[PDB]
Design a protein around this ligand. Structure first.
Ligand SMILES: NC(=O)c1ccc[n+]([C@@H]2O[C@H](COP(=O)([O-])OP(=O)([O-])OC[C@H]3O[C@@H](n4cnc5c(N)[nH+]cnc54)[C@H](O)[C@@H]3O)[C@@H](O)[C@H]2O)c1
Ligand SMILES: NC(=O)c1ccc[n+]([C@@H]2O[C@H](COP(=O)([O-])OP(=O)([O-])OC[C@H]3O[C@@H](n4cnc5c(N)[nH+]cnc54)[C@H](O)[C@@H]3O)[C@@H](O)[C@H]2O)c1
Ligand SMILES: OCc1c(F)c(F)c(F)c(F)c1F
Ligand SMILES: OCc1c(F)c(F)c(F)c(F)c1F
Ligand SMILES: [Zn+2]
Ligand SMILES: [Zn+2]
Ligand SMILES: [Zn+2]
Ligand SMILES: [Zn+2]
Lengths: 374, 374
């Protein structure tokens, strides 16, 4: 029995940038008031986790990363009302406190209790529940899913369907919901429209899924890796283009292809240049461009504001614009009701012990999502 | 008495950047097919006309500027169906061809026949109707309202109420409609919201009018010229701030004043720095910022796309997002029915012959709108 006790378990600790994860024993404290300790079942490898490794994202180290996952509640702290031991849950890397101005806003999801903007790498109370070799280890986004057990704040966990297949619905914790919501909720893609999707990884494929669900007539996938095009077409891309195949800049190609610009474009890579290209390729008077990718820390882009003055809309979003705790259970219910598919995003399924191999598959271009199983 | 004949009249010709206008005789050719020759009655001095003088806005010289005006049709060319001789009209600097993909789109207004994006300084047929000293003179935005007579394409003119006071409703041809629409149509300001308006000239005052019409609870005016604040409060500002009064950047001041960022911000100046400041000061998860000011030619801004990733929406618009030929007559009808006021924008009246004094009044900071009478 582990309730109220320190757990010694296995986790993937990142001690410093640009090094492999170290799979080793950590101590996980029991949950405090309004905290939940979760036995992990499955976690996806998102590019954002690789950004911590590469230094693209700055967050305090050493750290237990991982933010796309699903597991089963092991124990709850005093005052928890929304989950119980044995519940299937998804950790929420964007929390939903329910009390801040953003949570109360009909269109806000970026709760002010997040640990993204200005990361502390702690629980809400400014402390850590992790130690390794006698040293405190930072949390990541309130989730830290690269561990057999984590502790999260109640506002960072959602109860989901008890019959959920956790090795699939873990993707609702980041990449599926992000891409699908970027299309259906943030962009509000319209029936009959033309979309361009820059980056055909797990998140970009989810954007395609959402564009097709919304009834887009044309969905143009853009990637420098042509090995990504077959799966993009399977999930709804009508065309794919590789910028490297063209003498012209791709914004010009896409403007030509769309007879004057696309209705909706999405940056799903994380490069400053592709953010500006994606904006430019949407029709100048009524186009919408959504930034989804995460670019290198503290770098500014350059752009001509005439692109906006003519009438373009430029926006971005975290987690597809979804209010996390309200939406995650509904998305799992919709998956259970066959309203969308997750299998097209899953290319590899590895034990957790092969986390490094899973990151090498992402870096080499081979994988979409690797699911690690505990 | 002049139908089919060249008209000799006075115009304000700009031969060179950074020089006074030259009031002198020009020849105005009769209208060709689908053209309309207009006897001007009143024209406003908009900062965009001053941009042509300063080189902020690049358009071919020599030129007859002016784009905010009203007049009476003198004659129509073959095939014109939408106006007749003797009709009161407003020239439309943003055309409405009614046929292009933008005109057909429910939210588009930046018609593809515009002469703004890549100015030619011609009629739609690529030629000029103006001669001065035997030399061809450029048009400006298809309107060229700084002339006793102009010729415009039919898609660039709207028939308005025959009982219209032309010395007021000229402002519907640019500054009022731009600012009002930027609030009510482009931003879609909501009841109870907090707005910030950067720049309190005729366009920013019109933005305030729209934010007040929309029910905003707080409207914060921002200007470095504190002489602008009294009128801004008369038309709806709840409070005004001068960035020069503060040690901290005004985006930080405005974020503090709004307990975490404003719902809606407007850049109504034309500076790259205030475009980024205005974006920054809107709430990071659900704020909306609208660029209205005209940026300096060919210059890029620098900004961190994390401002957008958190959830902000950034857009711009020409002419308040209004489809010009549909909207201008309705706006005049609404003015006739006292649905909005134009007098708060008019600070000075001068004869056309005193156009240079009118530009001096704008450059000194004294005026909002000077209305020139022919
Ligand atoms: N906004 C959010 O809430 C959120 C959520 C999840 C992921 N992300 C970010 O979204 C991005 C995509 O994540 P992912 O799908 O896991 O990554 P991924 O699986 O690495 O996919 C990226 C794709 O971009 C392609 N690519 C790389 N460079 C270019 C280029 N120059 N032109 C066109 N294609 C290019 C690359 O070949 C790959 O297929 C990353 O920056 C993530 O950090 C953001
Ligand atoms: N998008 C459109 O369709 C459209 C239409 C009309 C006007 N414009 C542009 O809108 C802008 C405003 O035009 P307008 O109202 O006629 O001009 P204006 O009367 O010159 O007003 C501009 C205001 O900005 C103030 N200002 C200048 N610098 C700063 C600063 N650093 N911070 C704060 N305030 C400052 C200035 O004191 C003045 O009151 C100009 O750039 C026009 O070219 C655009
Ligand atoms: O993939 C989701 C994701 C983000 F969108 C971020 F902006 C971020 F900083 C991060 F750490 C993250 F995991
Ligand atoms: O004031 C309206 C106005 C604009 F918004 C422009 F973008 C522009 F180029 C121009 F010439 C103009 F007059
Ligand atoms: Zn909250
Ligand atoms: Zn992610
Ligand atoms: Zn048109
Ligand atoms: Zn103007």
């Amino acid at each position: 029995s582990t309730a109220g006790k320190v757990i010694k378990c296995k986790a993937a600790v990142l001690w410093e940038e640009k090094k492999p994860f170290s799979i080793e024993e950590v101590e996980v404290a029991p949950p405090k008031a309004h905290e939940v300790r979760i036995k992990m079942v499955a976690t996806g490898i998102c590019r954002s986790d690789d950004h911590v490794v590469s230094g693209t994202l700055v967050t305090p180290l050493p750290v237990i990363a991982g933010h796309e996952a699903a597991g089963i509640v092991e124990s709850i702290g005093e005052g928890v009302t929304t989950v119980r031991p044995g519940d299937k849950v998804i950790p929420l890397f964007t929390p939903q406190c329910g009390k801040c101005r953003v949570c109360k806003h009909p269109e806000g999801n970026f709760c002010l209790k997040n640990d993204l903007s200005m990361p502390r790498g702690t629980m809400q109370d400014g402390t850590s529940r992790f130690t390794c070799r006698g040293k405190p280890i930072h949390h990541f986004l309130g989730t830290s899913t690269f561990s057999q057990y984590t502790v999260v704040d109640e506002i960072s966990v959602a109860k989901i369907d008890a019959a959920s297949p956790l090795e699939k619905v873990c993707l609702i914790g980041c990449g599926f919901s992000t891409g699908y919501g970027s299309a259906v909720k943030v962009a509000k893609v319209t029936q009959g429209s033309t979309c361009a999707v820059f980056g055909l990884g797990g998140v970009g494929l989810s954007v395609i899924m959402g564009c097709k669900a919304a009834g887009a007539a044309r969905i143009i996938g853009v990637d420098i890796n042509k090995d990504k095009f077959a799966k993009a077409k399977e999930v709804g891309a009508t065309e794919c283009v590789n910028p490297q195949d063209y003498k012209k800049p791709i914004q010009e190609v896409l403007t030509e292809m769309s007879n004057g610009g696309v209705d909706f474009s999405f940056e799903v890579i994380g490069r400053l240049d592709t953010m500006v290209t994606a904006l430019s390729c949407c029709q100048e008077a009524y186009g919408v461009s959504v930034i989804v990718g995460v670019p290198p820390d503290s770098q500014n882009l350059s752009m001509n504001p005439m692109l906006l003055l003519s009438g373009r809309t430029w926006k971005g979003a975290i987690f597809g614009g979804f209010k996390s705790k309200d939406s995650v259970p509904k998305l799992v219910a919709d998956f259970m009701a066959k309203k969308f598919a997750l299998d097209p995003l899953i290319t590899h399924v590895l034990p957790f012990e092969k986390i490094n191999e899973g990151f090498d598959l992402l870096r080499s271009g081979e994988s979409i999502r690797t699911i690690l199983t505990f």
